[PDB]
Amino acid sequence: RFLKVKNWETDVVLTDTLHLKSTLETGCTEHICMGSIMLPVRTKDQLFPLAKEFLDQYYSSIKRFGSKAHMDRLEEVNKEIESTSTYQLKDTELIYGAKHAWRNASRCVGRIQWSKLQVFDARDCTTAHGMFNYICNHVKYATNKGNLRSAITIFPQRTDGKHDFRVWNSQLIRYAGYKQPDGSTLGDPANVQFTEICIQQGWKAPRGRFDVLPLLLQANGNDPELFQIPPELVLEVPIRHPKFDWFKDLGLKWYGLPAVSNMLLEIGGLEFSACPFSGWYMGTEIGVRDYCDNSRYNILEEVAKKMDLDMRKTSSLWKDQALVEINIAVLYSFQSDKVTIVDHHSATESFIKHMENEYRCRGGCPADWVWIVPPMSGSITPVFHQEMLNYRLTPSFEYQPDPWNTHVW
Amino acid sequence: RFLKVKNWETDVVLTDTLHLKSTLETGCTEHICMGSIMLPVRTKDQLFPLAKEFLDQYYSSIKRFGSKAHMDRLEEVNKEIESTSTYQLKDTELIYGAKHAWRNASRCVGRIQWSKLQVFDARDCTTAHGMFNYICNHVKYATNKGNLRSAITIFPQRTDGKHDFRVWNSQLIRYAGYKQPDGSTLGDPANVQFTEICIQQGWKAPRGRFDVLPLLLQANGNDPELFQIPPELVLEVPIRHPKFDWFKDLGLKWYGLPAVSNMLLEIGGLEFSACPFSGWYMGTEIGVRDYCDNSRYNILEEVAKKMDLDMRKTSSLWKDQALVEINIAVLYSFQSDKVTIVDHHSATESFIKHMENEYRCRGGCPADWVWIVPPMSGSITPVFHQEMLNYRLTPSFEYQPDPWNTHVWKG
Ligand code: HEM
Ligand code: HEM
Ligand SMILES: Cc1cc(N)nc(C[C@@H]2CNC[C@@H]2OCCN[C@@H](C)Cc2cccc(F)c2)c1
Ligand SMILES: Cc1cc(N)nc(C[C@@H]2CNC[C@@H]2OCCN[C@@H](C)Cc2cccc(F)c2)c1
Ligand SMILES: C[C@H](O)[C@H](O)[C@H]1CNc2nc(N)[nH]c(=O)c2N1
Ligand SMILES: C[C@H](O)[C@H](O)[C@H]1CNc2nc(N)[nH]c(=O)c2N1
Ligand SMILES: [Zn+2]
């Protein structure tokens, strides 16, 4: 019930007690581990225990647990739920909640940063045009001319579930994908379905390889509307290599701002279904996953050829050699253009320091090793050798399914 | 019930029913996943059900379930248990059991090979000298002058737990490690403690960087005895690089035969505490883990120095660049000397084919993603994108603690 985690490289042992505060279910059982599975309203009765649990943790954090102001706030919230079937968070509670949802995000390697998060309260937003304005401002603030700053923008909470705010896009900034008569895919194959929905709703597609998608915004449960983010707000980086002059000839670019827009933020039982957030990239996301996944831009074969490597046998490790060069290029290009990026060595080193901080100050740190270990060079980063316990704490970010299933037009 | 797994690269979905035959616990609960935790005598009462479950599985596999031969064997084993507190496996059952423990080993990427396993029955062994001879024969057979063949040697099972056979070595072939007074290590830092034990037991250590360790063998719960494997039986490969001629002067070599000697084989409730087994290497084990782990030979810096990489910032990815060249060197060296080895691209592609076949014919394939995904270039292998279900089937191989912690010294 008190659990140990060992680092096998350093022999450092840490004791986890924080897991006893976990509430939600993992998908694992005593008989079966689902650690590698990607995907393993509320009544008046359900809501007050969730609110109380959150408010207790909040008052504890500002060292006024059990105080008159603590008790008075639970009373106020209880009265509000009984009378209105929901409640409203104070600004201080919203900021605390959002920061802790990131602190609790077990799949995030970048959580050393969790307390530096700019929270934009968009709970007064009522229309899709309002949503577009908030999102442009988020984009501009976070981008900050390349000196990226972590931010979240929080739209109104769920009510009856028929008036949801949703950003239909999976990220604020992504590239279009189109199925070709030729049979191949042009652009990002990951975005073919979404690009189609955009065209159906009226988007005039440039039909290129790196077309920034428009936002499809849903306010108050209405049908979503299309908006183009001002091109001058979307900072993009041309990819070149410090040694290979031909690398720029591939015509690769990526955008500077990673901004997740499809998750659900739960704070004290309240559900924020549109809460786009952003930080900055770890280079392997772009160089390993976006560029080299077979189902993505899939560029390994082209780079390997330009490198004149022996592609006749797998054991020459041509894929591995080209992978490294692609990742050198991504980091170099971002660094040369003064756009914030972190390499996987540096990000995982910081995460180990964050884990030790959290064990020290909080009694643990939920972490999902399958996601935390980078998709290349796993065992030469310190997280590979670090045992991690994965469990679910609230406030939380949760995946939600694409709304084009949910939505009735 | 039915559990589904998806491959996120192919959208291929598979359905697991095999997990319903899982008995043992994972370490995980509804509230906590322990998937990255490395370590998450029986009564008559507990033994006959385990025996029966195993014999039922064995007789099904031979299409004789419920036959007179099946029923007679259940009866025979039941009588043996009630009267002697244990029972003996037939040779055929032992072979079946050992093959299935491999087939069930969820951390093993090499399982496409499971049904091709040479089983050496060493249950007539009585002394450490006898163990030494069996192990020499296993090494010679498995090595096969570089054309490696999978094998396992099975010593007598546990009785009262006071008479255990154990190989104290974690692998049959490993290099010594020596902590120096200045805090540095000569040789393999993974083997410092075991090396100190060998020396205490009377081994004359050459004190070099790649000294093959002697075997330390316990028969019948007696104190272990030291034996040197004949050097002519230990195949080794000097490591060189196809394009970098200075790579040879790093002085690196490795042994060809990976042979795990510290695991416990459970078949039908019986416990084989000494069951050394061997296959062949995947290149990354040596080039990534043995050479490049910080707590092992730790050669990354020296290699990248010689490659004249920019080592001022981790973001030049010098470690990644040096890692790839070291792994090319290991594969090239083994291949050039005609010693069996498999690269991680080939091994993972074969594992996916194995797993898909297993889902079709067996209803599942337990797999531990944390271990199956290679320690370099993870996502450019198909296994990275494959959802896996981890659960425990028997027969099985299990970790057991090192014997020096538990051994009752007799003197
Ligand atoms: C400050 C720089 C940040 C870095 C370097 C970083 C790093 C990462 C990385 C590499 C991943 C895995 C991404 C993937 O493979 O899809 C991730 C996941 C995630 N992070 Fe962060 N992160 C940062 C900021 C943030 C912020 C600001 C938040 C929320 C306020 C956040 C919450 C999450 C969540 C919920 C996931 C899982 C996403 C999913 O399930 O798709 N992170 N982080
Ligand atoms: C034939 C070629 C084989 C290949 C290429 C192969 C590959 C591997 C690899 C790469 C690992 C992980 C090693 C590590 O990180 O320590 C492993 C683990 C393992 N394999 Fe295999 N394997 C082979 C044969 C065998 C055989 C013959 C057996 C037993 C009969 C076996 C049973 C196991 C077990 C029990 C583990 C887990 C070891 C532990 O927990 O320490 N494998 N295999
Ligand atoms: C089925 C499924 C479930 C789930 N929870 N997430 C996904 C999204 C899948 C999971 N890895 C690939 C795809 O996301 C890529 C976007 N993630 C990055 C931008 C997150 C990020 C990084 C750095 C900073 C930051 F703020 C956010 C899919
Ligand atoms: C705490 C702990 C638990 C556990 N189950 N295993 C270990 C052993 C740890 C696990 N990775 C490092 C150390 O094994 C090194 C040996 N592994 C190879 C030889 C297995 C193998 C490969 C190829 C063929 C073959 F037959 C066997 C440690
Ligand atoms: C099947 C497996 O769980 C899946 O491919 C995971 C593995 N680890 C990952 N890790 C990160 N950071 N992001 C991912 O998308 C994935 N994909
Ligand atoms: C902490 C973590 O579980 C541990 O370092 C694991 C990760 N994956 C591994 N995978 C393999 N094949 N072998 C290992 O020793 C390990 N070590
Ligand atoms: Zn689990």
From Swiss-Prot, chain A:
Residues reported to bind L-arginine: 171, 280-281, 285
Annotated positions binding heme b: 108, 399
Effect annotated for changing residue 281 to H: 50% decrease of nitric-oxide synthase activity
Expressing tissues: Isoform N-NOS-1 is expressed in brain and colorectum. Found in the Auerbach's plexus of the enteric nervous system. Isoform PNNOS is expressed in the penis, urethra, prostate, and skeletal muscle, and coexists with the cerebellar nnos in the pelvic plexus, bladder and liver, and is detectable in the cerebellum.
Highest taxon, organism lineage: Eukaryota
Result of changing residue 281 to S: 30% decrease of nitric-oxide synthase activity
Record PTM: Ubiquitinated; mediated by STUB1/CHIP in the presence of Hsp70 and Hsp40 (in vitro).
Localization in the cell: Cell membrane, Sarcolemma; Cell projection, Dendritic spine
Binding-site positions, (6R)-L-erythro-5,6,7,8-tetrahydrobiopterin: 36, 370-371, 384
Domain notes: The PDZ domain participates in protein-protein interaction, and is responsible for targeting nNos to synaptic membranes. Mediates interaction with VAC14.
Quaternary structure (record): Homodimer. Interacts with DLG4 (via N-terminal tandem pair of PDZ domains); the interaction possibly being prevented by the association between NOS1 and CAPON. Forms a ternary complex with CAPON and RASD1. Forms a ternary complex with CAPON and SYN1. Interacts with ZDHHC23. Interacts with NOSIP; which may impair its synaptic location. Interacts with HTR4. Interacts with SLC6A4. Interacts with VAC14.
Family statement drawn from the similarity comment of this UniProt entry: Belongs to the NOS family.
Protein purpose: Produces nitric oxide (NO) which is a messenger molecule with diverse functions throughout the body. In the brain and peripheral nervous system, NO displays many properties of a neurotransmitter. Inhibitory transmitter for non-adrenergic and non-cholinergic nerves in the colorectum. Probably has nitrosylase activity and mediates cysteine S-nitrosylation of cytoplasmic target proteins such SRR. Inhibitory transmitter for non-adrenergic and non-cholinergic nerves in the colorectum.
Record's protein name: Nitric oxide synthase 1
Organism taxonomic ancestry: Eukaryota, Metazoa, Chordata, Craniata, Vertebrata
Gene coding for it: Nos1
Shown part of the complete sequence: 299 to 716 of 1429
